[PDB]
Amino acid sequence: PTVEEAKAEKETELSLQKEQLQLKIIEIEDDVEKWQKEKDRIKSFTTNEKAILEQNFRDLVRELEKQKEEVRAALEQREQDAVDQVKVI
């Protein structure tokens, strides 16, 4: 080959090989950013679900405390009822 022909071929080859390398880097980086976004999404979902669990628990305890209060005041009303039902004879 001519000196000018081998020059031009080298330039073509390097230009095409550069582009291959760049594409592969883009692929690696897309895969990594997608991996990382998924990991972060799962973390974010768990954090949310734990917050909702914690709020369910607090609502449950509050509802049960309120039921306990109803039973207590019932006990106190059966009490006074019974104390008035006891005659002096």
Binding mask 26-45 for its own copies (x = CB under 8 A): -----xx-xx--xx--xx--
Beta carbon of residue 46, minimum distance to its own copies (angstroms, whole number): 4
Which residues 65-84 are close enough to bind its own copies by CB under 8 A?
65, 68, 71-72, 75-76, 78-79, 82-83
The conformation of residue 86, written as its DSSP 8-state character, comes to S
What single string gives the DSSP state of each residue in 65-81? Answer: HHHHHHHHHHHHHHHHH
Nearer to its own copies (CB atom), residue 3 or residue 75 = 75
Beta carbon of residue 21, minimum distance to its own copies (angstroms, whole number): 19
Task: Provide the b/e sequence for 59-80 (b: ≥16 CB within 10 Å).
Answer: eeeeeeeeeeeeeeeeeeeeee
